[PDB]
Design a protein around this nucleic acid. Structure first.
Ligand SMILES: [K+]
Ligand SMILES: [K+]
Ligand SMILES: [K+]
Ligand SMILES: [K+]
Ligand SMILES: [K+]
Ligand SMILES: [K+]
Ligand SMILES: [K+]
Ligand SMILES: [K+]
Ligand SMILES: [K+]
Ligand SMILES: [K+]
Ligand SMILES: [K+]
Ligand SMILES: [K+]
Ligand SMILES: [K+]
Ligand SMILES: [K+]
Ligand SMILES: [K+]
Ligand SMILES: [K+]
Ligand SMILES: [K+]
Ligand SMILES: [K+]
Ligand SMILES: [K+]
Ligand SMILES: [K+]
Ligand SMILES: [K+]
Ligand SMILES: [K+]
Ligand SMILES: [K+]
Ligand SMILES: [K+]
Ligand SMILES: [K+]
Ligand SMILES: [Mg+2]
Ligand SMILES: [Mg+2]
Ligand SMILES: [Mg+2]
Ligand SMILES: [Mg+2]
Ligand SMILES: [Mg+2]
Ligand SMILES: [Mg+2]
Ligand SMILES: [Mg+2]
Ligand SMILES: [Mg+2]
Ligand SMILES: [Mg+2]
Ligand SMILES: [Mg+2]
Ligand SMILES: [Mg+2]
Ligand SMILES: [Mg+2]
Ligand SMILES: [Mg+2]
Ligand SMILES: [Mg+2]
Ligand SMILES: [Mg+2]
Ligand SMILES: [Mg+2]
Ligand SMILES: [Mg+2]
Ligand SMILES: [Mg+2]
Ligand SMILES: [Mg+2]
Ligand SMILES: [Mg+2]
Ligand SMILES: [Mg+2]
Ligand SMILES: [Mg+2]
Ligand SMILES: [Mg+2]
Ligand SMILES: [Mg+2]
Ligand SMILES: [Mg+2]
Ligand SMILES: [Mg+2]
Ligand SMILES: [Mg+2]
Lengths: 59, 101, 91, 61
RNA sequence: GGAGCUGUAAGUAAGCUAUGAUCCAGAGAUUUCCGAAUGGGGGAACCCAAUAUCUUUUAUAGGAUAUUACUUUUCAGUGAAUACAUAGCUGAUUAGAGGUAGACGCAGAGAACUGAAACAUCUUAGUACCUGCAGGAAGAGAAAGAAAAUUCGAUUCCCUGAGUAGCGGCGAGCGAAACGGGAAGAGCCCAAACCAACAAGCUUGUUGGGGUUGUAGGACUCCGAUAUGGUAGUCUGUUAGUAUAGUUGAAGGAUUUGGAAAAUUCCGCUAAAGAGGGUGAAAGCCCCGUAGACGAAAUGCUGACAACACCUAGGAGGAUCCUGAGUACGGCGGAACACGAGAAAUUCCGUCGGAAUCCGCGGGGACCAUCCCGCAAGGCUAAAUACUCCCUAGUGACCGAUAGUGAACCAGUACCGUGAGGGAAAGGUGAAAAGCACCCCGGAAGGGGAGUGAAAUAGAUCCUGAAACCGUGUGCCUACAA
RNA sequence: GUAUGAGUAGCGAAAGACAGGUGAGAAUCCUGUCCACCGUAUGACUAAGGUUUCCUGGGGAAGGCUCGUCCGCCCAGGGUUAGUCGGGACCUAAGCCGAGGCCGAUAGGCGUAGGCGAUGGACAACAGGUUGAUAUUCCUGUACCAGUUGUUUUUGUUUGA
RNA sequence: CUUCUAGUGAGAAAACAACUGCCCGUACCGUAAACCGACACAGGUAGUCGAGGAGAGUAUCCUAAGGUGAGCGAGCGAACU
């Protein structure tokens, strides 16, 4: 969440962004197949990346 | 709306006048509310709804919020609602008795 | 753009499944991605080695629901052929 | 534009009046001349009206 | 703000939410590509680059980031014919391009149909259109004025003068202004003379001081004052208010009809609230509101306060000096003044000629004299005035679906045209989908039952359901009639 | 909006026949057989143009001048694979744009350098196979063009390849 | 594109091995029912290939490859056109 993002460091935030991007890629593949159940997780991950990028820019 | 989910309300207009029940669902945008056992409708349902008969189901339909009044939990009677801040928290108050909620 | 954003999703159809038997996989890719970028993205994402990459532009398809008619989004389709001695992509 | 570099004179529209007072639009032009003059210390050919030159204060390099 | 929420838009599916979501307001971040589009190109939303850094690969290929249009200002460097230089070229710097609101303003250019019962002067009309420039307003504005009551004292706009004075193939028509009454009100800066500084080439350019006028002013020379007042200045602060969300906000139960009460009847109650809207029919007391009270973290806007900033002198003498030149004015040709060359002032443009300067100059409708009024050829200036694409809150003896915007509805859409362009039709089930389970005929469509509903001849071509038109049934008549 | 004409004109150049099948339903859809038509075309390729009309599976509301079980229609999925083919990262014609510039009430007109612009010039791969739908594009086989890294063998290092 | 020097130059060339090579189009109709003619319209639509007998021939008749039976029919066999 936003509080945790602010706690993290610059390098930590960048690594978290990469991890979330990979997870979003995996979710896209699972949704393309029938292997995804929690569809809302995609929007959650996208908004999480948005929060991380917003914090990065406001630093 | 002045009435809220889970409230005990009295119907003051309609075929179900003077009945009392708990609020099951609230729709502020429509200014409507559903009270258990109030305004029940027979609905001709095809069996496509996981019920392998379809049948004639019975369900409560919403009624306009203005047609109900919150039941005083302390007195058990319907009353109008004022708003008083109690101990720094805004709450509903019965105009007939002054009890909260 | 980011490599992880280059590839959007796989394509599962009869033609794509036959491609897989020949060890080639069909992906929908960003419409601005060229086959060289697609090759780089596939290698990074899947650890495989890419032998070749073919790419097509799928035109928007006209559709209509009731009284409203429009076009499906244009797409870019890439068939990626992996070399021998390469891990298969798992879906 | 074909405008006096100093006095700002420029082409304008007038009337042709016959003895019957019939009116038709005409163009009335100033008497401009291409003259080599010093602007900010450098020579240049610019349009200048004979009226502007009349005083003699405009250098004639 | 306090309980639901993931739009229209149901449905499934998956989720969020008192750890305060959705939602509302202020601020901020991201904001692909085209488009003035501006690295170059281009058939807009596409293509291809150079330079520098970074990234993928063993490496080429590949990717990301930043800069790179043209012109204007300024500076600097380089630098031709040519010696000096300039011009060019390079870099940096500076501010412009484009769109609007089909409105309002100023200016350039500028019709015809039409009227004259024809038509050319004239009128339509300096209108329509095109173009440039703008500002929130613009334009005008501080007398070379209006007058001749003796006076007034910048401009603008309104009423009036007045359809008058006048203009006009003296036709058709066009048509003032001053006085008077009002809205609003505000006055100020330079050029010049003179002094000082600076540089060059005693004057001759820059800077500063000085001066801004007609009951003539200023310089200059004497004196005396170094005040008194003001501002049309500032992202200067403080303060108050206000705009952009909101909070609170009185008082009704029964009775009869009805599917349903607000309607009827009976008794009540509130009102700083009996505006309005919704609710199963018509509600002061059911809901949203209204009167009233209250409220702003954040950003705007306004007014005040202070701060800073900037303007602000009195009296006396003229010997001399200054007071806007190719200007005023005149000829010629046009144009604007209500005024069409007319006796023609006044003002403007083009061309040519061309003054005086305080014993001076301009105007007072040709012109001269006297008298009176004013002081051009430099600039700025708020308010009263004009308009509304927009946003907010309202109003209507304004329209109510062939009306009202073309468009109440996915309308400048469908459709038409190569293109500019032209341009529609189309609102209403029910209180509530309770949108007809199930059965029967049928392949379906569509019906008949059975149900929902107060009502289904309210069944989605759905409120009402007219006429034309079509059809069924029949009380009377009709196959010797024009 | 609905009549009248009126159940009238018309149903747009030509050969179909029968058997079987499907289907609620068949002159009209499918299969078969014979017959007939075009064959410098009514065949096979392609440019432009159209823009999914292509393939598969469903459907018979509307459209098809009849019918329709069918379709270039409707519904749902799917389909276009390039270093070598055409175009761009190559060149230019006509024409067009046009830095400065010339000209001009405004707007703008013209035009140099420089560019754009093919219908032309230059340019490396062909045969076969494969799918329901793509193929000098995928696959098989065998090539060619441009270039990078490496190994080796050669040869030049400033009278310098 | 091939040469010439000017310039530039410490690395070039050959063989071999391995490897790299971007963007747009690619469906389908295309002397037509899919384009231009409002139509599934007797019209128009550039270029290529376009066979055999007789034949000068791409004429003409009948055929090959290949394509097609034309999106209303069944009767009757009057006038009239
Ligand atoms: K452009
Ligand atoms: K407007
Ligand atoms: K006329
Ligand atoms: K007339
Ligand atoms: K002004
Ligand atoms: K009048
Ligand atoms: K007359
Ligand atoms: K002064
Ligand atoms: K109610
Ligand atoms: K009411
Ligand atoms: K404030
Ligand atoms: K005159
Ligand atoms: K005067
Ligand atoms: K009804
Ligand atoms: K009858
Ligand atoms: K008719
Ligand atoms: K008829
Ligand atoms: K079918
Ligand atoms: K060509
Ligand atoms: K193809
Ligand atoms: K022969
Ligand atoms: K022949
Ligand atoms: K047929
Ligand atoms: K007959
Ligand atoms: K006949
Ligand atoms: Mg391709
Ligand atoms: Mg560009
Ligand atoms: Mg006339
Ligand atoms: Mg402005
Ligand atoms: Mg209240
Ligand atoms: Mg009452
Ligand atoms: Mg006049
Ligand atoms: Mg003159
Ligand atoms: Mg005069
Ligand atoms: Mg007089
Ligand atoms: Mg006087
Ligand atoms: Mg003003
Ligand atoms: Mg009506
Ligand atoms: Mg209308
Ligand atoms: Mg009825
Ligand atoms: Mg009706
Ligand atoms: Mg008889
Ligand atoms: Mg009889
Ligand atoms: Mg007849
Ligand atoms: Mg036919
Ligand atoms: Mg022939
Ligand atoms: Mg087909
Ligand atoms: Mg089919
Ligand atoms: Mg039919
Ligand atoms: Mg040109
Ligand atoms: Mg094919
Ligand atoms: Mg093809």
């Amino acid at each position: 969440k936003v509080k945790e993002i602010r706690e993290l460091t610059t390098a930590e935030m960048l690594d978290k962004e990469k991890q979330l991007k990979e997870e979003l890629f995996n979710l896209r593949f699972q949704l393309a197949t029938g292997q995804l159940e929690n569809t809302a997780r995609i929007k959650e991950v996208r908004q999480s990346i948005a929060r991380i990028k917003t914090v990065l820019r406001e630093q | 709306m002045f009435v809220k989910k889970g409230d005990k309300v009295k119907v003051i207009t309609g075929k179900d006048k003077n009945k009392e029940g708990v609020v099951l669902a609230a729709f502020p945008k429509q200014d409507k509310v559903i009270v258990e056992g109030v305004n029940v409708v027979k609905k001709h349902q095809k069996p496509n709804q996981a019920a392998p008969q379809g049948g004639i189901l019975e369900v409560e339909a919403p009624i306009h919020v203005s047609n109900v009044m919150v039941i005083d939990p302390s007195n058990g009677e319907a009353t109008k609602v004022a708003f008083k801040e109690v101990d720094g928290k805004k709450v509903r108050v019965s105009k007939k008795t002054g009890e909260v909620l | 753009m980011e490599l992880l954003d280059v590839i959007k999703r796989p394509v599962i159809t009869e033609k794509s499944m036959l491609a897989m038997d020949e060890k080639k996989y069909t992906f929908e890719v960003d419409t601005r991605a060229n086959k060289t970028l697609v090759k780089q993205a596939v290698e990074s994402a899947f650890d495989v080695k890419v032998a070749n990459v073919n790419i097509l532009n799928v035109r928007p398809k006209f559709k209509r629901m009731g009284k409203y008619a429009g076009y499906t989004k244009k797409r870019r389709k890439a068939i990626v052929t992996l070399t021998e001695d390469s891990k298969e992509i798992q879906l | 534009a074909k405008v006096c570099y100093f006095t700002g004179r420029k082409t304008s529209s007038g009337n042709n009046r016959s003895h019957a007072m019939n009116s038709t639009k005409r163009t009335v032009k100033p008497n401009l001349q291409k003259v080599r003059v010093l602007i900010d210390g450098k020579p240049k050919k610019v349009w200048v009206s004979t009226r502007a030159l009349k005083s003699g204060k405009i250098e004639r390099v």
